Amino acid sequence: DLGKKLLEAARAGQDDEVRILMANGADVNATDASGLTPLHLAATYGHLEIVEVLLKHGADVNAIDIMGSTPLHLAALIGHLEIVEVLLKHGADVNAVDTWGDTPLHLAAIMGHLEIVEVLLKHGADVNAQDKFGKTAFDISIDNGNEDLAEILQK
Amino acid sequence: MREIVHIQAGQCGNQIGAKFWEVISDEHGIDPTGSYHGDSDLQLERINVYYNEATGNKYVPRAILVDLEPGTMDSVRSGPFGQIFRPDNFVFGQSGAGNNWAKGHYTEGAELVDSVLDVVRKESESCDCLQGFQLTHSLGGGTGSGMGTLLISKIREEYPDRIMNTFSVMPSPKVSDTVVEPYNATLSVHQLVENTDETYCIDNEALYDICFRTLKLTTPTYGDLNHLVSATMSGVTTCLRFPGQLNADLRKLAVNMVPFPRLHFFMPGFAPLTSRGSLTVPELTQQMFDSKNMMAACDPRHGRYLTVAAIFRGRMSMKEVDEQMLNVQNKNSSYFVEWIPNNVKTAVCDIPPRGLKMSATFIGNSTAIQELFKRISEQFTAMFRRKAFLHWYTGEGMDEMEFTEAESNMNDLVSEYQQYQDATAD
Amino acid sequence: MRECISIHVGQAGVQIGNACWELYCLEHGIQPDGQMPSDKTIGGGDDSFNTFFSETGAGKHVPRAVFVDLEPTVIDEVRTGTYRQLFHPEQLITGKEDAANNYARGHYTIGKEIIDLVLDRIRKLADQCTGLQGFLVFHSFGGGTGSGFTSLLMERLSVDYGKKSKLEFSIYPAPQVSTAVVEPYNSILTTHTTLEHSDCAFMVDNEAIYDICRRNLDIERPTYTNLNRLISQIVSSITASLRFDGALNVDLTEFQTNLVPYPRIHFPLATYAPVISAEKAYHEQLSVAEITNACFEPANQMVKCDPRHGKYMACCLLYRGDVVPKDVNAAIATIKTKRSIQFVDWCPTGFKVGINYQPPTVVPGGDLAKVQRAVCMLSNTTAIAEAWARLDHKFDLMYAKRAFVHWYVGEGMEEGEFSEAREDMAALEKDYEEVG
Ligand SMILES: Nc1nc2c(ncn2[C@@H]2O[C@H](COP(=O)(O)OP(=O)(O)OP(=O)(O)O)[C@@H](O)[C@H]2O)c(=O)[nH]1
Ligand SMILES: Nc1nc2c(ncn2[C@@H]2O[C@H](COP(=O)(O)OP(=O)(O)OP(=O)(O)O)[C@@H](O)[C@H]2O)c(=O)[nH]1
Ligand SMILES: COc1ccc(/N=N/c2cc(OC)c(OC)c(OC)c2)cc1O
Ligand SMILES: [Ca+2]
Ligand SMILES: [Mg+2]
Ligand SMILES: [Mg+2]
C-alpha cells in the first residue's frame, strides 16, 4: 500500500520518496487512523516543499482529520509561516473551525506566533469567531495580558 | 544551618548560575582566582554558606555544574569567573537532550544521574551543617527541566530532611518560540509541586516585557534578560549571605512564607529596574510592589498576598522603612489576606549591590501567580489536544498518562490559588 | 538559705539572661571575674545572695544558671563578652541546628537530641544545693526553642523535681519586633503544655516594653538591647526579695501563696515606676505618692491590658529606696478612695507591702536615669484575660484555614494537638470570666 508509505514520507521530509510514490499511484489524499493526510503531516512537520508538491497533485487543502483540524490549523499552531502563506495562496479556509471551536487565528494567538496572526488578519480571519467557551482571539489576548497580541488584534 | 550546595543544570541553568557566582563574588570581595580582596569584615562573616575554604585561604564555590551537552562546559570556563569552579565538579555527558523532557528524565539524563549524585555526596559530607540545596534551571528545555527534576527527586530520597530550593525559569514564545516548551514546563511543574520546598518563578515573559516596554531595548538578548535575573538572585540571597539582626536560613523562610505545602511558587520583584552599561524609601516601596517590577508576568492587584518578604539594601533609616511598609499595607489592604496576621516581613542590609546606592527586593507568595500557570496550561492544552509531537516523548519510554496527570495537577494548583484568593476571615 | 536555679532557653531567654546577671552582679557588688570583696565568708556562706550564687574555694561567686539554645550564635556571645568568666563553661549548652520558629522541632525532633545533656548538667547544679527551692525559667513564647524546648524541659523537670517550684519569665509576642508569622501557634502550644507544670508566670509583652521605651525613654526605634535593659530592671525588682533580706515574697512558695489564688490563673501583671530617661540627669524626685499612683496607670504595665475592666485577686507593692513606711500607708489610703480598684468579694481587699531601703542600681550604658525610689507592683487581675484573647484571635484566623499546620505535622506532631491546645485556652478565658 503506497498510501501508508506516502504518509510516512511526508512526515519524515523525504522529498524524492513523495515524488516516486505519487508517480506509482500513491493516494495523495490517503488518511491515517485519525484522518491525517500527507498534507496535514507535511504542514505539521514543516516540510514546505512537500506541501507545494502535494498541492500541485490534487491534495485537498481543506481536508479535516477526526478532530476537524485542517492543515492550516496545524501550520498556525506549530508556527510555520511559509507554509501558512502557501496554504492560503492555494485556497485554505482562513476561518475553518475544529471540534474545540478554534480557528487558525485562535491557535496562532495562544502559541504567540504574532507574524502568523498578522498574516491571518490580512487574509480575512474573523476577530468575532468564538471558541466552545465563547472566547475570541481578542479575549485570549486580554485574559493572558499579552499587550503585543492585543495591539495587533486592535489594528 | 550553614552550607548550601548549589547545582546548575542545562544551558539556561549554567548561564544564570555563572552570572550568580560572578555577581555574589564581587559583593563578597572575591576575585576570579579565588582570593579575598574585600574591605569590610561583613563580607566574610557568612562566606561559608556558598563558599568552601581551601588551602592558601582560597574560596571555592560549593557549585556542581551539569549538562547532557558538552559544549556548555567550555562556555562556563571561558567566562570571567570560569576557572574559579572545582574542575572535578563538572559532570558533562556526550549527547544533549534536544528540548526533550523525556530524554532528560528517562534515557540520556538517567545515565548521567548516578555520576552527579557522587559529586553531591562529596560536597555534602564535607559540610558542618548542610542547610539544603539550590538548583538553577529552565523548565522549557530538556536537561534543566527533565534531568533537573530527576536530580531533585533523587536528592530528596537521599537527603529528605533538607530544604530543596530552585530558581526556575519559565518559557515564553517572546524569547523562545519552540512549541514543545509548554509540554516540558508542564511536566516539570508536576514534579516541582511535589518535590521542592520553595521555587522562585523567573518568567522569560516578564523579563522580555521589562526589557522591551520599561528599559526600551527593542531587541533583548540573553545577556539583557540575565541582568535582571542576577540582580534578583543577588537580592533574594542577601539575608543568607550577610549577618543582619535575623539569622535567616532556607527553613525559616519556608515555615514563614509557605502556608500550604503545594503553594511554594514565589513571585520575586526588584527595584530599581536598570539596564546593562547604563531613589528614596517611599519610591522604593512603591516600585517594589508595582506589577511592572515583578519577575513573573502576573498583576499582583489581580490576586492577594498570602505572605511577603522584602529586603531593603543600603544606608537608610529603618524607622522610615517601617513607616513606609505599614503605609503600603494600609492603602493597598485589599491585596493582603486578613486571615494571616502580620504576613509582611522586612529586613535591612547595610551592604548594597554593585552600581546601586539603594535597592529593594520583593518575595511574594501571591494568589496572582495562577496567571502564569494558566498561560502555560492554555498552551499545553492547545498542543496536547492535537497530540502534536507526542511520539518524540512516548518513544523515549513515556506513557501518555503522564501528560494527562501533569495537566490535571497544574489545573488543580490554579484552583487551589483561586480558593485562597476568595477565602474570607469572617 | 534555699537555692534557686535560673534556666535561660533560646535567644530571648539567653539575651534577657545576660542583662539580668549583669544587673545582679552590680547590685551585689560582684565583679565580672566572680570576685566579691564585701563577702567575708570565703568559699561558702548562708547569705541571701547565696540563693542565686554559689562559691568556689577561690572566692569566685558563680551564677546558679543554665543557658540552653539549639543553635550556638547567641550563647557564643556570652562565651566571649564581658561576663565570659562568670559562668560555669559547662552551664552554657548549644546544639547545631535550631527549631526554625517551629514548636514541633523544639519539642519533638531537634529538642530530643539535647534534652538528656541539659537535664544531667542541671542535676550537677542541683547536687551542689543544700535545700533547692526550684527554678526560674526564661523564654520567649514565639521562638521554636523558647516554645517547644521549654515545654519538653518543663515536663521533665516535673518528673525529676516533683516537689520544687517552677516560675517563668515569658516573652509575649509583639508585631513591632517579631520574627515569625507562626508565633501565635507556638504561643498557644507552649501555654497549653506548660500550664500544669508552672506555678507562677510573669509575661512580658514586647509591645508594652516597646511603647515604654518610645514614650518614657524617647527612643525612636527600640532595639532588643533597649528592651532587655528595661526588662532586666523589672525582673530584678521581682527577684530582689529572693536575694536580699526582707519580709515579702522571701521564697518561691510565697509568690504562689501571695499571687496565685487558683492553679491555672497563675499570670500576675507587673507594673513599674518611675521610668525616666538618662538624658534627664537632674530630674525632679517623685514622691512615694506619685510613684504609687503611677502603678495604676495602664501605660506603665508590662502587659497591655486595662485593669479598670477587671477585678483584683491579689496586689503586692515592692518598694526600693528612700521610702518611709507611713508614706506608703498614706498613699494606699488615698488610692483606696477610687472606683477603679475592685477586688473579688472572696479575697481580702488588702495590699501587701515590702520595702528594700537600697535605691535601684542602673547599669553603665543603660537608658534609665538613677532614682531615689522605685516601686514594682505585682497584681493578679482578670484584665490579663485581654492579652490571652488577642493571642487566641490571631491563632483562630490562621487555624480556621489550617495555614502553616503541615510544618508542625511534618515534625512528629498530630493535628489534634492544635485543637486540644486551643480548647485549653478557651477554658482558661472562661476561668477568668468565672472569677469576674
Ligand atoms: N532567561 C534565560 N532563559 C534562557 C537562557 N538560556 C536558555 N533559556 C531558556 O531556556 C529554555 C531552553 O532550555 P535550555 O536551558 O536551553 O535547555 P537545556 O536544559 O540545556 O536542554 P537541551 O539542550 O534541550 O538538552 C528556553 O525557554 C530558553 O528561552 C538564558 O541564559 N537566560
Ligand atoms: N524582649 C526580647 N524579645 C526577644 C529577644 N530575642 C527574641 N525576642 C522575641 O522572641 C521571639 C522569637 O523567639 P527567639 O527566642 O528568638 O527564638 P528561639 O527561642 O531561639 O527559637 P528558634 O530560633 O525558633 O529555635 C520573638 O517574639 C522576638 O521578638 C530579646 O533579646 N528580647
Ligand atoms: C511573612 O512572614 C515572614 C516571612 C519570612 C520571614 N523570614 N524569612 C526570611 C525572609 C527574608 O527576607 C526578609 C529572607 O531573605 C530572602 C530570608 O533569607 C533566607 C528568610 C519571616 C516572616 O515572619
Ligand atoms: Ca560567702
Ligand atoms: Mg541545551
Ligand atoms: Mg533561635
**Ramachandran area for residue B331 (φ above 0: left; ψ -120 to 50: alpha; else beta):** alpha
What DSSP string describes C233-271? HHHHHHHHHHHS--SSS-SHHHHHHHH-SSTT----EEE
Identify whether the C-beta of residue C218 lies closer than 8 Å to the C-beta of residue C279.
yes
Q: What is the 3-state secondary structure (H, E, C) of chain B?
A: CCCEEEEEEHHHHHHHHHHHHHHHHHHCCECCCCCECCCCHHHCCCHHHCEEEECCCEEEECEEEEECCCHHHHHHHCCCCHHHCCHHHEEECCCCCCCCHHHHHCCHHHHCHHHHHHHHHHHHHCCCCCCEEEEEEECCCCHHHHHHHHHHHHHHHHCCCCEEEEEEEECCCCCCCCCCHHHHHHHHHHHHHHHCCEEEEEEHHHHHHHHHHHCCCCCCCHHHHHHHHHHHHHHHHHHHHCCCCCCCCHHHHHHHHCCCCCCCEEEEEEECCCCCCCCCHHHHHHHHCCHHHECCCCCHHHCCEEEEEEEEECCCCHHHHHHHHHHHHHHCHHHECCCCCCCEEEEEECCCCCCCCCEEEEEEEEHHHHHHHHHHHHHHHHHHHCCCCCHHHHCCCCCHHHHHHHHHHHHHHHHHHHHHHHCCCC
Strand partners, B267: B364
Give me the residue label for grid cell 531615689.
C372
Position B303, amino acid: G
B69 is in an annotated binding site: yes
Q: Is the CB of A110 less than 8 angstroms away from the CB of B374?
A: no
Distance of CA B98 to the CA centre of its chain: 23
Q: How many CB pairs under 8 A join A and B?
A: 45
Q: Are C227 and C213 in contact (CB under 8 A)?
A: yes
**Is A58 exposed, middle or buried (CB count within 10 Å of its CB: 0-12, 13-18, 19+)?**
exposed
**φ/ψ of residue C293, rounded to 5:** -60, -45
User: Alpha helices of chain A — where are they, by DSSP H?
Assistant: 2-12, 15-23, 38-44, 48-55, 71-78, 81-89, 104-110, 114-122, 137-143, 147-154
> Residue B330, Cβ neighbours under 10 Å: how many?
7
Q: Which domain holds residue B304?
A: 260-368
* CB burial readout A107-120, b (16+ within 10 A) else e: bbbbbbbbebbebb
* Rounded Cα distance, C344 and A5, in Å: 99
CA separation for the pair B305, B303 (Å, rounded): 7
State the Cα–Cα distance between residues B299 and B12, nearest whole angstrom: 25
Name the CATH superfamily for A1-155: Ankyrin repeat-containing domain (1.25.40.20)
CB contact under 8 A, B379 and A145: no
Distance CA B154, CA B100 (A): 20
What is the DSSP code (8-state) at residue C322? Answer: S
Mark C227-263 as b/e (b = at least 16 C-beta within 10 Å).
Answer: bbbbbbbbbbbbbbbbbbebebbbbbebbbebbbbee
C144 labeled binding residue: yes
B407-423: b (≥16 Cβ within 10 Å) or e: bebbeebbebbeebbeb
Distance CA A105, CA A117 (A): 6
Q: How many CB atoms lie within 10 A of CB C173?
A: 25
Cα C192 from chain centroid (whole Å):
18
Is-catalytic flag, C284? no
Residues 6+ apart with CB under 8 A from B426: none
d(CA B168, CA C68): 39
Tell me whether C100 touches chain B (CB under 8 Å): yes
- Strand order in C4-9's β-sheet? C92-94, C65-69, C4-9, C134-140, C165-172, C200-205
Those residues whose C-beta lies under 8 Å from the C-beta of residue C263, and which sit 6 or more positions away, are C199
C-alpha C93/C-alpha C121 separation (Å) is 9
Please tell me the number of the ligand nearest to residue C59's CA.
4
Q: Which of B209, B371, B382 sits opposite A77 (nearest CB)?
A: B382
Nearest one of B377, B234, B219 to B295, comparing CA atoms = B234
Q: Is residue A92 within 8 Å of residue A70, measured between CB atoms? A: yes
CATH of the domain at B394: 1.10.287.600
Number of domains in chain B: 3
Q: Which chain C residue is nearest to residue B128, measuring alpha carbons?
A: C96
Please, which experimental method was used?
Answer: X-ray
How far is residue C152's CA from residue C113's CA, in Å, rounded to a whole number? Answer: 12
- CB spacing of C400 vs B246 below 8 angstroms: no
Partners of C71 on chain B (C-beta within 8 Å) are 1, 247
Q: Work out the minimum CA distance from B402 to partner chain A, whole angstroms.
A: 22
Q: Which atom of ligand 2 is nearest to the CA of C98?
A: 25
Alpha carbon distance C122, C112 (integer Å): 16
> Is B235 annotated as ligand-binding?
no
Is B57 within any annotated ligand binding site?
no
The finding on whether B24 has its CB within 6 A of some atom of ligand 1 is no
B395 and B350 belong to one structural domain: no
Phi, psi (deg, nearest 5) at residue C224: -60, -35
Q: Which of C101, C184, C220 sits opposite B319 (nearest CB)?
A: C220
Which of C192, C191, C132, C136 has the alpha carbon at shortest distance from C162? C132
State whether the beta carbon of B343 lies less than 6 angstroms from ligand 3: yes
For C351, the 3-state DSSP assignment is coil
Mutational test site, ligand 3, from B304, B345, B365, max ligand atoms within 8 Å of CB: B345
Residue C319, SS3 per DSSP: strand
Relative to beta strand C61-63, strand C53-55 is antiparallel
Residues B7 and B144 in one domain: yes
> Which domains can be identified in chain C, with CATH numbers?
1-268 (3.40.50.1440), 269-383 (3.30.1330.20), 384-436 (1.10.287.600)
Same domain, B280 and B225: no
Domain boundary among B230, B259, B288: B259
Element containing residue C356 per DSSP (H, E): strand C352-356
Our CA dihedral for B167, B173, B179, B183, rounded to 10 degrees, sits at 30
C48 Cα: distance to centroid of ligand 4 (angstroms)? 10
Query: What does the block give as the cell for C337?
Result: 478612695
The DSSP H or E segment spanning C92 is strand C92-94
Identify the CATH number of the domain in which residue B332 sits. 3.30.1330.20
> Which residue of B66, B106, B116, B138 sits with most ligand 1 atoms within 8 Å of its CB, as the best mutation to test the pocket?
B138
- Contact at 8 Å (CB) between B345 and B306? no
How do strand B163-170 and strand C352-356 relate by DSSP bridges?
Answer: unpaired
Q: Give the chain B residue whose CA is nearest to the CA of A101.
A: B382
Set of chain B residues whose Cβ sits within 8 Å of the Cβ of A77: 179, 382-383, 386, 388
- Hey, is the C-beta of B53 within 8 angstroms of any chain A C-beta? no
CA distance C9 to chain B (A): 17
Is C225 labeled as ligand-binding?
A: no
Ligand 3 pocket test: pick from B167, B239, B242 the residue with the most ligand atoms within 8 Å of its Cβ.
B239
Is B118 found in the same domain as B43?
Answer: yes
Q: B329 CB under 6 A from ligand 3?
A: no
Pairing of strands C269-273, C373-381: antiparallel
Give the sign of the dihedral formed by CA B237, CA B243, CA B245, CA B251: positive
In whole angstroms, what is the distance from residue B277 CA to residue B298 CA? 28
Nearest to C394 by CA among C170, C148, C175, C105: C175
Cis peptide leading into B70, omega within 30 of 0?
A: no
**C143 phi, psi to nearest 5 deg:** -75, 160
Q: State whether B179 and A111 contact (CB < 8 Å).
A: yes
Q: Entry resolution in angstroms? A: 1.8
Domain boundary among B216, B240, B259: B259
Q: Which residue of B has its CA nearest to C397?
A: B339
CA separation for the pair B425, B304 (Å, rounded): 13
Grid coordinates representing A66 are 477526526
* Residues in a beta bridge with B5: B133
Nearest by CB to residue C180, choosing from B249, B255, B322, is B255
| Cβ–Cβ < 8 Å for C347, C394 | no
Q: Whose CA is closest to B229, among B25, B13, B60?
A: B13
Cα-based distances in Å from C60 to B63, C34, C54, C86, C88: 51, 5, 8, 8, 11
d(CA B378, CA C142): 44
Measured between alpha carbons, how far is B115 from B113 in angstroms, rounded to an integer? 5
Residues 6+ apart with CB under 8 A from B242: B42, B45, B46, B349, B350, B351
Nearest atom in ligand 1 to B72's CA: 20
Q: Tell me: cis bond preceding C274? Omega within 30 of 0 counts.
A: yes
- Nearest residue of A to residue B181 by CA position? A111
SS (H, E, C) C164-210: CEEEEEEEECCHHHCCCCCHHHHHHHHHHHHHHHCCEEEEEEHHHHH
The reply to whether residue B371 touches residue A107, judged by beta carbons under 8 angstroms, is: no
Q: Where are the beta strands (DSSP E) in C361-425?
A: 373-381
Q: In chain C, count of helices (H) and strands (E)?
A: 15, 12
Task: Provide the 3-class DSSP secondary structure of residue C304.
Answer: coil
B259, B279, B312 - which closes a domain: B259
Euclidean distance between CA atoms C427 and C436, whole angstroms: 14
In this structure, the answer to whether residues B236 and B279 fall within a common structural domain is no
- What DSSP character marks residue A67? T
User: Rounded to the nearest 10 degrees, how much is the dihedral formed by the CA atoms of C379, C383, C387, C389?
Assistant: 150
In C, which residues are within 8 Å of B318 by CB distance?
221
Distance CA B291, CA B293 (A): 5
Q: Are residues B203 and B135 in the same domain?
A: yes
Cα B201–chain centre separation = 6
B39-47 long-range contacts (CB < 8 A, ≥24 apart) are: B40/B351, B42/B242, B42/B243, B42/B350, B42/B351, B43/B351, B45/B242, B45/B243, B46/B240, B46/B241, B46/B242, B46/B243, B47/B241
CATH number of domain containing B252:
3.40.50.1440
Residues found in chain B? 426
Q: Do the bridges between strand B265-271 and strand B359-366 make them parallel or antiparallel, or are there none, so unpaired?
A: antiparallel
**Paired residues of C167 in beta bridges:** C136, C200
**Cα(C9) to centroid(ligand 6), Å:** 9
Task: Compute the distance between CA of residue B20 and CA of residue B230 in angstroms, rounded to an integer.
Answer: 5
Q: For residue B226, what are the contacts with CB-CB under 8 A and spacing of at least 6?
A: B15, B16, B19
Ligand (nearest to CA of C153) = 2
Same domain, B15 and B162: yes
Q: d(Cα B173, Cα C358) in Å, to the nearest integer?
A: 79
CB count within 10 Å of CB B265 equals: 26
Could you give the CA distance from residue C15 to residue C160 in angstroms, rounded to a whole number? 27
